[PDB]
PDB file of C-alpha atoms and ligand atoms in Angstrom:
ATOM      1  CA  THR A   1      57.550  66.269   3.396  1.00 30.19           C
ATOM      2  CA  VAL A   2      59.180  65.577   0.019  1.00 27.87           C
ATOM      3  CA  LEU A   3      57.362  66.133  -3.265  1.00 30.05           C
ATOM      4  CA  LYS A   4      58.829  64.188  -6.194  1.00 33.99           C
ATOM      5  CA  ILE A   5      58.263  65.415  -9.760  1.00 33.23           C
ATOM      6  CA  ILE A   6      59.334  63.452 -12.852  1.00 33.79           C
ATOM      7  CA  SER A   7      59.526  64.773 -16.416  1.00 33.11           C
ATOM      8  CA  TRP A   8      59.714  62.502 -19.485  1.00 34.36           C
ATOM      9  CA  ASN A   9      59.535  62.875 -23.218  1.00 35.78           C
ATOM     10  CA  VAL A  10      58.005  59.490 -23.936  1.00 38.63           C
ATOM     11  CA  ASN A  11      58.174  59.746 -27.772  1.00 38.72           C
ATOM     12  CA  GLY A  12      54.510  58.612 -28.079  1.00 36.84           C
ATOM     13  CA  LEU A  13      52.356  57.427 -25.178  1.00 39.30           C
ATOM     14  CA  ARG A  14      51.175  54.279 -26.955  1.00 40.55           C
ATOM     15  CA  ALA A  15      54.805  53.370 -27.709  1.00 39.06           C
ATOM     16  CA  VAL A  16      56.095  53.801 -24.143  1.00 40.28           C
ATOM     17  CA  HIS A  17      53.121  51.744 -22.879  1.00 37.24           C
ATOM     18  CA  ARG A  18      54.317  48.865 -25.081  1.00 35.48           C
ATOM     19  CA  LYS A  19      57.730  49.278 -23.422  1.00 39.13           C
ATOM     20  CA  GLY A  20      57.045  49.141 -19.668  1.00 34.96           C
ATOM     21  CA  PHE A  21      55.613  52.584 -18.845  1.00 35.66           C
ATOM     22  CA  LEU A  22      52.930  51.469 -16.340  1.00 33.43           C
ATOM     23  CA  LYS A  23      55.237  49.072 -14.449  1.00 30.65           C
ATOM     24  CA  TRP A  24      57.821  51.851 -14.194  1.00 31.36           C
ATOM     25  CA  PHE A  25      55.252  54.482 -13.097  1.00 32.27           C
ATOM     26  CA  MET A  26      53.872  52.138 -10.401  1.00 31.04           C
ATOM     27  CA  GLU A  27      57.366  51.548  -8.973  1.00 30.29           C
ATOM     28  CA  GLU A  28      58.630  55.159  -9.161  1.00 34.22           C
ATOM     29  CA  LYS A  29      55.549  56.647  -7.432  1.00 33.51           C
ATOM     30  CA  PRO A  30      56.118  60.335  -8.180  1.00 30.39           C
ATOM     31  CA  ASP A  31      53.745  62.954  -6.756  1.00 30.08           C
ATOM     32  CA  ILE A  32      53.609  64.578 -10.188  1.00 30.45           C
ATOM     33  CA  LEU A  33      54.545  63.122 -13.558  1.00 29.94           C
ATOM     34  CA  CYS A  34      54.935  65.453 -16.521  1.00 31.29           C
ATOM     35  CA  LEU A  35      54.946  63.899 -19.961  1.00 29.41           C
ATOM     36  CA  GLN A  36      55.857  65.268 -23.400  1.00 32.96           C
ATOM     37  CA  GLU A  37      55.144  63.972 -26.911  1.00 34.55           C
ATOM     38  CA  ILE A  38      51.910  62.145 -26.233  1.00 34.05           C
ATOM     39  CA  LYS A  39      51.131  61.884 -30.005  1.00 31.02           C
ATOM     40  CA  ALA A  40      47.552  60.704 -29.341  1.00 31.82           C
ATOM     41  CA  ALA A  41      44.009  62.027 -29.295  1.00 34.18           C
ATOM     42  CA  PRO A  42      43.147  61.916 -25.594  1.00 35.17           C
ATOM     43  CA  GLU A  43      39.467  61.223 -26.440  1.00 33.87           C
ATOM     44  CA  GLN A  44      40.570  58.040 -28.270  1.00 34.21           C
ATOM     45  CA  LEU A  45      42.598  56.728 -25.282  1.00 30.92           C
ATOM     46  CA  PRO A  46      40.905  53.820 -23.446  1.00 33.09           C
ATOM     47  CA  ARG A  47      40.563  54.188 -19.663  1.00 33.35           C
ATOM     48  CA  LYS A  48      42.731  51.105 -19.016  1.00 35.09           C
ATOM     49  CA  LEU A  49      45.465  53.101 -20.756  1.00 35.63           C
ATOM     50  CA  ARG A  50      44.909  56.676 -19.518  1.00 36.92           C
ATOM     51  CA  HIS A  51      43.655  56.217 -15.931  1.00 36.97           C
ATOM     52  CA  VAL A  52      46.230  55.376 -13.256  1.00 33.54           C
ATOM     53  CA  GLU A  53      44.973  54.629  -9.733  1.00 33.31           C
ATOM     54  CA  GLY A  54      45.819  57.344  -7.183  1.00 32.99           C
ATOM     55  CA  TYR A  55      46.341  59.981  -9.887  1.00 33.06           C
ATOM     56  CA  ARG A  56      44.394  62.699 -11.612  1.00 32.52           C
ATOM     57  CA  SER A  57      45.372  63.265 -15.261  1.00 32.48           C
ATOM     58  CA  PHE A  58      45.241  66.209 -17.651  1.00 32.40           C
ATOM     59  CA  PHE A  59      46.024  66.009 -21.384  1.00 35.35           C
ATOM     60  CA  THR A  60      46.893  68.898 -23.720  1.00 34.31           C
ATOM     61  CA  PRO A  61      46.920  67.775 -27.389  1.00 32.88           C
ATOM     62  CA  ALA A  62      48.041  69.617 -30.538  1.00 30.75           C
ATOM     63  CA  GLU A  63      45.612  70.849 -33.198  1.00 30.90           C
ATOM     64  CA  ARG A  64      47.520  68.573 -35.564  1.00 28.12           C
ATOM     65  CA  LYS A  65      46.530  64.921 -35.427  1.00 25.75           C
ATOM     66  CA  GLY A  66      49.088  62.635 -33.789  1.00 26.16           C
ATOM     67  CA  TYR A  67      51.616  65.454 -33.295  1.00 25.06           C
ATOM     68  CA  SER A  68      53.312  66.721 -30.136  1.00 22.84           C
ATOM     69  CA  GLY A  69      50.988  66.856 -27.060  1.00 24.02           C
ATOM     70  CA  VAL A  70      51.762  66.921 -23.357  1.00 24.76           C
ATOM     71  CA  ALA A  71      50.139  65.480 -20.227  1.00 25.10           C
ATOM     72  CA  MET A  72      50.306  65.571 -16.467  1.00 25.23           C
ATOM     73  CA  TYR A  73      49.545  62.993 -13.740  1.00 22.43           C
ATOM     74  CA  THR A  74      49.242  64.221 -10.163  1.00 24.84           C
ATOM     75  CA  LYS A  75      48.126  62.757  -6.827  1.00 25.15           C
ATOM     76  CA  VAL A  76      46.895  66.184  -5.712  1.00 25.00           C
ATOM     77  CA  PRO A  77      45.104  68.200  -8.419  1.00 25.93           C
ATOM     78  CA  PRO A  78      46.068  71.769  -9.337  1.00 24.87           C
ATOM     79  CA  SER A  79      43.416  74.471  -8.902  1.00 24.31           C
ATOM     80  CA  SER A  80      43.439  74.769 -12.713  1.00 23.56           C
ATOM     81  CA  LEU A  81      45.754  74.472 -15.747  1.00 20.56           C
ATOM     82  CA  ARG A  82      46.548  76.958 -18.532  1.00 20.55           C
ATOM     83  CA  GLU A  83      47.405  75.632 -21.958  1.00 21.62           C
ATOM     84  CA  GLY A  84      49.068  78.597 -23.658  1.00 20.35           C
ATOM     85  CA  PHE A  85      50.967  81.909 -23.532  1.00 14.08           C
ATOM     86  CA  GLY A  86      48.179  83.841 -25.277  1.00 12.27           C
ATOM     87  CA  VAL A  87      49.848  83.671 -28.698  1.00 10.84           C
ATOM     88  CA  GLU A  88      47.840  81.589 -31.224  1.00 13.52           C
ATOM     89  CA  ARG A  89      50.778  80.083 -33.156  1.00 14.15           C
ATOM     90  CA  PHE A  90      52.440  78.848 -29.916  1.00 12.67           C
ATOM     91  CA  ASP A  91      49.246  77.690 -28.158  1.00 17.02           C
ATOM     92  CA  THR A  92      47.944  75.229 -30.778  1.00 16.21           C
ATOM     93  CA  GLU A  93      50.851  72.745 -30.946  1.00 15.24           C
ATOM     94  CA  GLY A  94      50.182  70.775 -27.734  1.00 18.13           C
ATOM     95  CA  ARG A  95      53.349  72.170 -26.186  1.00 20.47           C
ATOM     96  CA  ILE A  96      52.189  74.092 -23.108  1.00 18.89           C
ATOM     97  CA  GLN A  97      50.621  72.945 -19.881  1.00 18.58           C
ATOM     98  CA  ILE A  98      50.957  75.202 -16.843  1.00 18.73           C
ATOM     99  CA  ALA A  99      49.438  73.836 -13.610  1.00 20.43           C
ATOM    100  CA  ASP A 100      48.672  76.035 -10.614  1.00 22.76           C
ATOM    101  CA  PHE A 101      49.534  74.173  -7.415  1.00 21.71           C
ATOM    102  CA  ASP A 102      49.496  76.037  -4.101  1.00 23.31           C
ATOM    103  CA  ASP A 103      53.141  76.832  -3.800  1.00 25.63           C
ATOM    104  CA  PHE A 104      54.229  76.997  -7.423  1.00 23.25           C
ATOM    105  CA  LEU A 105      53.183  77.021 -11.025  1.00 21.85           C
ATOM    106  CA  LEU A 106      54.461  73.947 -12.837  1.00 24.65           C
ATOM    107  CA  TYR A 107      55.270  74.570 -16.485  1.00 22.18           C
ATOM    108  CA  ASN A 108      55.258  71.310 -18.432  1.00 22.90           C
ATOM    109  CA  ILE A 109      56.727  72.320 -21.808  1.00 25.87           C
ATOM    110  CA  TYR A 110      57.634  70.576 -25.027  1.00 24.80           C
ATOM    111  CA  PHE A 111      59.832  73.196 -26.704  1.00 23.55           C
ATOM    112  CA  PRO A 112      60.032  73.061 -30.510  1.00 20.72           C
ATOM    113  CA  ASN A 113      62.754  71.310 -32.492  1.00 18.93           C
ATOM    114  CA  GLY A 114      64.532  73.681 -34.886  1.00 20.14           C
ATOM    115  CA  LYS A 115      66.337  71.142 -37.098  1.00 22.37           C
ATOM    116  CA  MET A 116      63.630  70.889 -39.801  1.00 23.27           C
ATOM    117  CA  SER A 117      64.091  74.310 -41.412  1.00 25.60           C
ATOM    118  CA  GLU A 118      65.081  77.943 -40.814  1.00 24.17           C
ATOM    119  CA  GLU A 119      61.362  78.727 -40.353  1.00 25.54           C
ATOM    120  CA  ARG A 120      61.038  76.112 -37.577  1.00 24.63           C
ATOM    121  CA  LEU A 121      64.266  77.403 -36.020  1.00 27.19           C
ATOM    122  CA  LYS A 122      62.702  80.896 -36.067  1.00 26.16           C
ATOM    123  CA  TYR A 123      59.557  79.451 -34.498  1.00 30.58           C
ATOM    124  CA  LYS A 124      61.659  77.721 -31.807  1.00 30.20           C
ATOM    125  CA  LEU A 125      63.497  80.911 -30.814  1.00 27.18           C
ATOM    126  CA  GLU A 126      60.307  83.008 -30.799  1.00 26.36           C
ATOM    127  CA  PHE A 127      58.555  80.295 -28.751  1.00 27.53           C
ATOM    128  CA  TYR A 128      61.502  80.636 -26.341  1.00 26.47           C
ATOM    129  CA  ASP A 129      60.854  84.421 -26.361  1.00 28.24           C
ATOM    130  CA  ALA A 130      57.138  84.032 -25.579  1.00 27.32           C
ATOM    131  CA  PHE A 131      57.911  81.482 -22.826  1.00 27.22           C
ATOM    132  CA  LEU A 132      60.400  83.861 -21.131  1.00 25.99           C
ATOM    133  CA  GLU A 133      57.846  86.686 -21.304  1.00 26.20           C
ATOM    134  CA  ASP A 134      55.253  84.370 -19.720  1.00 25.65           C
ATOM    135  CA  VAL A 135      57.379  82.995 -16.880  1.00 25.91           C
ATOM    136  CA  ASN A 136      58.846  86.471 -16.163  1.00 26.65           C
ATOM    137  CA  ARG A 137      55.308  87.896 -15.930  1.00 27.98           C
ATOM    138  CA  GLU A 138      54.328  85.165 -13.450  1.00 26.55           C
ATOM    139  CA  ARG A 139      57.625  85.322 -11.540  1.00 26.36           C
ATOM    140  CA  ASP A 140      57.339  89.161 -11.414  1.00 27.81           C
ATOM    141  CA  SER A 141      53.931  88.895  -9.740  1.00 30.73           C
ATOM    142  CA  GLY A 142      55.374  86.854  -6.863  1.00 32.03           C
ATOM    143  CA  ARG A 143      54.764  83.312  -8.124  1.00 34.01           C
ATOM    144  CA  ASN A 144      57.327  80.590  -7.556  1.00 37.30           C
ATOM    145  CA  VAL A 145      57.812  78.540 -10.693  1.00 35.99           C
ATOM    146  CA  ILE A 146      59.042  75.110 -11.686  1.00 36.78           C
ATOM    147  CA  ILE A 147      59.707  74.572 -15.394  1.00 36.42           C
ATOM    148  CA  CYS A 148      60.323  71.100 -16.802  1.00 33.62           C
ATOM    149  CA  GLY A 149      60.400  69.446 -20.165  1.00 31.49           C
ATOM    150  CA  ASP A 150      62.255  69.050 -23.406  1.00 32.35           C
ATOM    151  CA  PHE A 151      64.080  72.278 -24.194  1.00 32.85           C
ATOM    152  CA  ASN A 152      65.587  70.720 -27.361  1.00 32.94           C
ATOM    153  CA  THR A 153      68.887  72.503 -26.682  1.00 30.59           C
ATOM    154  CA  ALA A 154      72.048  71.385 -24.864  1.00 26.64           C
ATOM    155  CA  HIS A 155      73.352  74.301 -22.811  1.00 27.88           C
ATOM    156  CA  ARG A 156      77.128  73.932 -22.621  1.00 29.61           C
ATOM    157  CA  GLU A 157      79.823  71.739 -24.239  1.00 28.92           C
ATOM    158  CA  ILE A 158      79.591  69.395 -21.241  1.00 28.40           C
ATOM    159  CA  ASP A 159      75.906  68.794 -22.063  1.00 31.26           C
ATOM    160  CA  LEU A 160      76.497  66.689 -25.183  1.00 29.77           C
ATOM    161  CA  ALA A 161      78.991  64.084 -26.416  1.00 30.75           C
ATOM    162  CA  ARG A 162      79.966  65.871 -29.642  1.00 28.72           C
ATOM    163  CA  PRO A 163      79.949  69.656 -29.088  1.00 28.48           C
ATOM    164  CA  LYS A 164      82.278  70.486 -31.995  1.00 28.69           C
ATOM    165  CA  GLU A 165      80.472  68.505 -34.735  1.00 23.27           C
ATOM    166  CA  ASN A 166      77.114  69.972 -33.669  1.00 24.12           C
ATOM    167  CA  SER A 167      78.252  73.646 -33.643  1.00 22.72           C
ATOM    168  CA  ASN A 168      75.935  74.329 -36.596  1.00 22.49           C
ATOM    169  CA  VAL A 169      73.177  71.821 -35.856  1.00 21.07           C
ATOM    170  CA  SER A 170      69.980  73.056 -34.198  1.00 24.55           C
ATOM    171  CA  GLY A 171      70.143  71.846 -30.615  1.00 24.81           C
ATOM    172  CA  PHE A 172      73.612  73.353 -30.146  1.00 25.71           C
ATOM    173  CA  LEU A 173      73.626  76.542 -32.238  1.00 25.37           C
ATOM    174  CA  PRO A 174      75.236  79.554 -30.514  1.00 20.93           C
ATOM    175  CA  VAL A 175      71.883  81.408 -30.788  1.00 22.98           C
ATOM    176  CA  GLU A 176      70.073  78.603 -28.890  1.00 23.53           C
ATOM    177  CA  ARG A 177      72.764  78.185 -26.244  1.00 24.92           C
ATOM    178  CA  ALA A 178      72.728  81.988 -25.789  1.00 21.95           C
ATOM    179  CA  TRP A 179      69.010  81.887 -25.045  1.00 22.49           C
ATOM    180  CA  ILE A 180      69.536  79.407 -22.200  1.00 24.24           C
ATOM    181  CA  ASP A 181      72.256  81.782 -20.929  1.00 20.71           C
ATOM    182  CA  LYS A 182      69.670  84.587 -21.142  1.00 15.91           C
ATOM    183  CA  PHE A 183      66.945  82.491 -19.449  1.00 16.71           C
ATOM    184  CA  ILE A 184      69.381  81.727 -16.582  1.00 17.92           C
ATOM    185  CA  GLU A 185      70.585  85.362 -16.445  1.00 15.34           C
ATOM    186  CA  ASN A 186      66.905  86.339 -15.984  1.00 12.29           C
ATOM    187  CA  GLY A 187      66.845  84.511 -12.644  1.00 13.21           C
ATOM    188  CA  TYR A 188      66.152  80.812 -13.303  1.00 13.57           C
ATOM    189  CA  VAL A 189      68.345  77.967 -12.144  1.00 12.20           C
ATOM    190  CA  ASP A 190      69.338  74.780 -13.974  1.00 11.74           C
ATOM    191  CA  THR A 191      68.658  72.516 -11.006  1.00 13.71           C
ATOM    192  CA  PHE A 192      70.600  69.473 -12.236  1.00 11.83           C
ATOM    193  CA  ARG A 193      73.823  71.505 -12.174  1.00 11.34           C
ATOM    194  CA  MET A 194      73.155  72.565  -8.559  1.00 11.06           C
ATOM    195  CA  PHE A 195      74.039  68.967  -7.619  1.00 11.11           C
ATOM    196  CA  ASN A 196      75.948  67.321 -10.451  1.00 13.15           C
ATOM    197  CA  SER A 197      78.861  68.932 -12.302  1.00 16.73           C
ATOM    198  CA  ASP A 198      79.922  65.771 -14.160  1.00 17.32           C
ATOM    199  CA  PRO A 199      80.205  65.154 -17.930  1.00 17.13           C
ATOM    200  CA  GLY A 200      78.453  62.311 -19.778  1.00 16.96           C
ATOM    201  CA  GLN A 201      75.125  63.208 -18.149  1.00 16.74           C
ATOM    202  CA  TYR A 202      72.557  63.166 -20.965  1.00 17.20           C
ATOM    203  CA  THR A 203      68.806  62.699 -21.419  1.00 16.78           C
ATOM    204  CA  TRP A 204      68.453  61.991 -25.160  1.00 15.22           C
ATOM    205  CA  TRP A 205      70.268  59.571 -27.499  1.00 18.10           C
ATOM    206  CA  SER A 206      69.495  58.876 -31.146  1.00 16.42           C
ATOM    207  CA  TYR A 207      67.851  55.478 -31.636  1.00 14.44           C
ATOM    208  CA  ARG A 208      70.369  55.221 -34.506  1.00 16.78           C
ATOM    209  CA  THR A 209      74.105  54.458 -34.592  1.00 18.46           C
ATOM    210  CA  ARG A 210      73.979  52.661 -31.199  1.00 17.47           C
ATOM    211  CA  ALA A 211      74.012  56.101 -29.525  1.00 14.19           C
ATOM    212  CA  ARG A 212      72.687  55.078 -26.122  1.00 16.30           C
ATOM    213  CA  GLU A 213      75.197  52.239 -25.689  1.00 14.66           C
ATOM    214  CA  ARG A 214      77.958  54.601 -26.834  1.00 13.57           C
ATOM    215  CA  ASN A 215      76.597  57.407 -24.593  1.00 13.01           C
ATOM    216  CA  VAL A 216      76.517  59.758 -27.591  1.00 12.53           C
ATOM    217  CA  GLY A 217      73.783  61.826 -26.064  1.00 13.35           C
ATOM    218  CA  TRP A 218      72.584  65.323 -25.293  1.00 12.42           C
ATOM    219  CA  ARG A 219      71.074  66.857 -22.152  1.00 12.40           C
ATOM    220  CA  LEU A 220      67.866  68.241 -23.634  1.00 15.00           C
ATOM    221  CA  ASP A 221      65.568  67.846 -20.620  1.00 16.13           C
ATOM    222  CA  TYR A 222      65.727  70.144 -17.605  1.00 18.28           C
ATOM    223  CA  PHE A 223      64.127  71.207 -14.351  1.00 22.21           C
ATOM    224  CA  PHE A 224      64.465  74.984 -13.815  1.00 19.98           C
ATOM    225  CA  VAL A 225      63.223  76.949 -10.788  1.00 16.39           C
ATOM    226  CA  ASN A 226      63.271  80.678 -10.060  1.00 17.79           C
ATOM    227  CA  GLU A 227      66.123  81.861  -7.816  1.00 18.00           C
ATOM    228  CA  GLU A 228      63.874  82.465  -4.741  1.00 20.75           C
ATOM    229  CA  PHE A 229      62.558  78.909  -4.796  1.00 19.59           C
ATOM    230  CA  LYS A 230      65.910  77.124  -5.179  1.00 17.40           C
ATOM    231  CA  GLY A 231      66.362  76.522  -1.429  1.00 19.41           C
ATOM    232  CA  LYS A 232      63.408  74.145  -1.550  1.00 19.26           C
ATOM    233  CA  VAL A 233      65.132  71.985  -4.161  1.00 20.57           C
ATOM    234  CA  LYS A 234      66.728  68.940  -2.545  1.00 21.42           C
ATOM    235  CA  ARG A 235      67.476  66.652  -5.477  1.00 23.12           C
ATOM    236  CA  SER A 236      67.669  67.019  -9.236  1.00 24.75           C
ATOM    237  CA  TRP A 237      68.756  63.954 -11.183  1.00 25.92           C
ATOM    238  CA  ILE A 238      68.587  61.891 -14.380  1.00 27.69           C
ATOM    239  CA  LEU A 239      66.840  58.506 -14.408  1.00 29.64           C
ATOM    240  CA  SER A 240      69.331  57.257 -16.997  1.00 29.09           C
ATOM    241  CA  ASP A 241      68.560  53.538 -16.836  1.00 26.67           C
ATOM    242  CA  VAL A 242      64.796  53.862 -17.544  1.00 26.36           C
ATOM    243  CA  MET A 243      64.057  52.672 -21.101  1.00 26.91           C
ATOM    244  CA  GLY A 244      61.084  53.010 -23.442  1.00 29.75           C
ATOM    245  CA  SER A 245      61.831  56.265 -25.266  1.00 28.30           C
ATOM    246  CA  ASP A 246      64.773  58.047 -26.942  1.00 25.66           C
ATOM    247  CA  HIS A 247      64.760  60.286 -23.855  1.00 26.78           C
ATOM    248  CA  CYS A 248      65.021  59.073 -20.284  1.00 26.09           C
ATOM    249  CA  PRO A 249      63.084  60.675 -17.408  1.00 25.17           C
ATOM    250  CA  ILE A 250      64.505  63.369 -15.127  1.00 25.66           C
ATOM    251  CA  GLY A 251      63.581  63.940 -11.446  1.00 29.00           C
ATOM    252  CA  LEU A 252      63.109  66.793  -8.978  1.00 23.90           C
ATOM    253  CA  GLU A 253      62.550  66.478  -5.250  1.00 21.57           C
ATOM    254  CA  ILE A 254      61.405  69.519  -3.309  1.00 20.85           C
ATOM    255  CA  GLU A 255      60.666  70.131   0.348  1.00 24.26           C
ATOM    256  CA  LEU A 256      57.860  72.603   1.080  1.00 28.51           C
TER     257      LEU A 256
HETATM  258 MG1   MG B 301      60.311  61.987 -30.193  1.00 28.19          MG
END
């Protein structure tokens, strides 16, 4: 039995709905769909918009109105979800949704963008720190873990079109890249690279400067699993032709 999980930074749920979201979701039929950047008060969402037949849904909004926010659709519900690491400043931005399924925890994470300022870059790296602490704690206790979402960093030079010009832009700073190295070193596997070693494989393109048509993109969205669980991973891929956001969806298929 295959379980298909999709992750997508939709850049606003209302926006992606105007651009074919429901038709796409109906045709793709994942078992679990993880979404980032909802940008909406869930309580203000009409049912025609939020509810999708055959799926349970769970929404984790930011304190700040219209900002960030994540959500999860699933055919089979988790036993519960956790919405933070236990650290106030990281738990109030609508960035963390951790669902407990039988066989794994599924981390649906919208990691912070560090471009804004040195303070937001500091926040990003310390968020990374708190995340690693959290997943390590769970992984240490014998849990298998799947982590998906927008990491807001391209790992290696192959993971973006313009590595040299972005050497001092947040998203490709040596400090950020080094954290992904560290995360991997700690026993988590970048599942896409298990199957695809090719260049030009990205998940985000600026809406500006015709980036998507020029494939001037960055691989910012990942599926990671812990080392012990990797044997269950059968596919990890990029749904590059799916429109509606500045990111495209990514997919994981696992056999349990
Ligand atoms: Mg966005």
